[PDB]
Amino acid sequence: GVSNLVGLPNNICLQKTSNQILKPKLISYTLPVVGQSGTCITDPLLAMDEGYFAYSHLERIGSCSRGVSKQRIIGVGEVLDRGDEVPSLFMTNVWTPPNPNTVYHCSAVYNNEFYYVLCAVSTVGDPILNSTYWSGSLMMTRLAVKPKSNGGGYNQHQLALRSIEKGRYDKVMPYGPSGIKQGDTLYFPAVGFLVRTEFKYNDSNCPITKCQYSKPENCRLSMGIRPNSHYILRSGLLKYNLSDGENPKVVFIEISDQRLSIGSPSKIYDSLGQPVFYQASFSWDTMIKFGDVLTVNPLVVNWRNNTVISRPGQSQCPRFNTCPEICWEGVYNDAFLIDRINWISAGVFLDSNQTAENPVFTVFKDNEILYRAQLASEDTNAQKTITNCFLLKNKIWCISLVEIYDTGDNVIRPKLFAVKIPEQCTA
């Protein structure tokens, strides 16, 4: 079957090459995302663990940003080899909340037959864009990956969050596609909203050395979505111990201050016997942020010193920016570690400076891109990108979800690709 990337997988190519040895296969049609002309599919989540996956999206009628929310899909299922010997996703269980207008920022963790999905519940829109008026309310659903006919609360049911420990943070919420379980406590990528006049930051920790026109205040102002924001954002994890009587709390853990950046969508995952953490770059530090997790609680991450991977921005903080500016921009494009011995990772990235376009599956190390494969056209518009890799017959496969703009219908939709990591550098 399909299993996590653990133990001693088949060899992969380790050399920088321009040979086309990556051969992505399009596998969207196994999920309900091929879509209908007058509908936009937005706000996707994909998560994978132990032969299962959780998937979520919102469908809007008309406009992609201001359209009417038709339905929120939350499904789980299994990753299975089609006869082809190629992995693909198959739903087994799907749920829709009663009110699709109010669910935001879902995040999934798998544990022993069930996926847990933590979401924000808001009556004032995306909580990030109006945080003062957001109530801070949360919701968690449990889905069985193996539905059992008329299974009452086994198949689906919601859990009650009657206690949130958030220390000195006003509000706390899930903020990233997926997390990890730890026999058997759950950890969700999350973010904390700290009242700005409580943020202890020493401006003399802001790298201005040969950054022309970069005031040392910039690193503190950029910790909120706006230089005058009431809150600043701090990434971290939400802990949820399943073995806590009957009302397990949720405890916020903040990310350490090494290479601090405004809280943004993040991800924690298990690769080869140890957890990795990825944090999207939504401000001035535009080089990819991920690394082995030194310790989970408290959270400290051994950020890689990657010099080749970045992400497109706008005028102020374009791709490859490293100088402290005041900005809130960027895109979520994560990377999955596939070989620790050599620290090689795979991800889909947008190969452009100031426009979100040209999605390229790329395998890479800290200072070298080894090889790559265009996923669409060089002026294809794209956004969020979520990669998970695993084993199929001891061979490493990755599955990437990529938000692509469809020029026919003028709407975005998730495309799924399955990519085998080449076991040799010649075709």
Ligand X SMILES: *[C@@H]1O[C@H](CO)[C@@H](O[C@@H]2O[C@H](CO)[C@@H](O)[C@H](O)[C@H]2NC(C)=O)[C@H](O)[C@H]1NC(C)=O
Ligand Y SMILES: *[C@H]1O[C@H](CO)[C@@H](O[C@@H]2O[C@H](CO)[C@@H](O[C@@H]3O[C@H](CO[C@H]4O[C@H](CO)[C@@H](O)[C@H](O)[C@@H]4O)[C@@H](O)[C@H](O[C@@H]4O[C@H](CO)[C@@H](O)[C@H](O)[C@@H]4O)[C@@H]3O)[C@H](O)[C@H]2NC(C)=O)[C@H](O)[C@H]1NC(C)=O
Ligand Z SMILES: *[C@H]1O[C@H](CO)[C@@H](O)[C@H](O)[C@H]1NC(C)=O
* Shortest distance, position 214 Cβ to ligand Z, whole Å: 17
Shorter beta-carbon distance to ligand Y: residue 6 or 124: 124
- Check binding of 198 to ligand Z (CB under 6 A): no
* Shortest distance, position 320 Cβ to ligand X, whole Å: 4
* Shortest distance, position 312 Cβ to ligand X, whole Å: 9
Binding-site member from 259, 300, 395, 406 for ligand X (CB under 6 A): 259
Residues 123-142 that bind ligand Y (CB under 6 A): 124, 130, 133
Q: Which does 157 bind (CB under 5 to 8 A by kind): ligand Z, ligand X, ligand Y, none?
A: none
| 159 contacts 141 by C-beta, under 8 angstroms | yes
- Check binding of 243 to ligand Z (CB under 6 A): no
- Check binding of 257 to ligand Z (CB under 6 A): no
Q: Which does 92 bind (CB under 5 to 8 A by kind): ligand Y, ligand X, ligand Z, none?
A: none
Site string for ligand Z, 369-398 (x = CB under 6 A): ------------------------------
The Cβ of residue 55 has, within 10 Å, a number of other Cβ atoms equal to 26
The Cβ of residue 246 has, within 10 Å, a number of other Cβ atoms equal to 7
Q: Which residue has the tokens 């469908």?
A: 59
Report how far residue 149's alpha carbon sits from residue 241's, in angstroms, rounded to the nearest whole number.
28
* Shortest distance, position 206 Cβ to ligand X, whole Å: 14
- Check binding of 204 to ligand Z (CB under 6 A): yes
* Cα R_g (the chain), whole angstroms: 21
Q: Is 269 left (phi over 0), alpha (psi -120 to 50) or beta?
A: beta
Q: Which does 204 bind (CB under 5 to 8 A by kind): ligand X, ligand Y, ligand Z, none?
A: ligand Z
State the virtual CA torsion across 237, 104, 399, 271 in degrees, nearest 10: 10
How many helices (H) does the chain have, and how many strands (E)? 2, 27
| 287 contacts 346 by C-beta, under 8 angstroms | no
| 122 contacts 138 by C-beta, under 8 angstroms | no
Shorter beta-carbon distance to ligand X: residue 319 or 420: 319
Residues 289-308 that bind ligand X (CB under 6 A): 303-305
Shorter beta-carbon distance to ligand Z: residue 202 or 342: 202
Q: How do 138-144 and 164-165 pair as beta strands?
A: unpaired
Residues 213-252 that bind ligand X (CB under 6 A): none
Applying CB under 6 A, what is the total number of residues that bind ligand Y? 3
3-state helix/strand/coil string of 340-409: CCCCEEEEEEECCCCCCECEEEEEECCCCEEEEEECCCCCCEEEEEEEEEEEECCEEEEEEEEEEEECCC
Applying CB under 6 A, what is the total number of residues that bind ligand Z? 2
Residues 355-384 that bind ligand X (CB under 6 A): 366
Q: Which does 124 bind (CB under 5 to 8 A by kind): ligand Y, ligand X, ligand Z, none?
A: ligand Y
* Shortest distance, position 200 Cβ to ligand Z, whole Å: 7
- Check binding of 96 to ligand Z (CB under 6 A): no
Q: Which does 259 bind (CB under 5 to 8 A by kind): ligand Y, ligand X, ligand Z, none?
A: ligand X
Report how far residue 200's alpha carbon sits from residue 320's, in angstroms, rounded to the nearest whole number.
28
Q: Which does 63 bind (CB under 5 to 8 A by kind): ligand Z, ligand Y, ligand X, none?
A: none
* Shortest distance, position 205 Cβ to ligand Z, whole Å: 7
Report how far residue 187's alpha carbon sits from residue 169's, in angstroms, rounded to the nearest whole number.
18
Bridge partners (DSSP) listed for residue 303: 291
Peptide bond into 298 cis (omega under 30): yes
* Shortest distance, position 128 Cβ to ligand Y, whole Å: 10
Report how far residue 8's alpha carbon sits from residue 396's, in angstroms, rounded to the nearest whole number.
10
- Check binding of 202 to ligand Z (CB under 6 A): yes
| Distance (Å) of CA 48 to CA 83, 160, 267, 273, 380 | 21, 24, 12, 16, 27
For 26, the 3-state DSSP assignment is strand
Q: Name the residues that contact ligand Y, by CB under 6 A.
A: 124, 130, 133
Q: Residue numbers of the site for ligand Z (CB under 6 A)?
A: 202, 204
Interface ranges with ligand X (CB under 6 A): 258-259, 303-305, 319-320, 353, 366
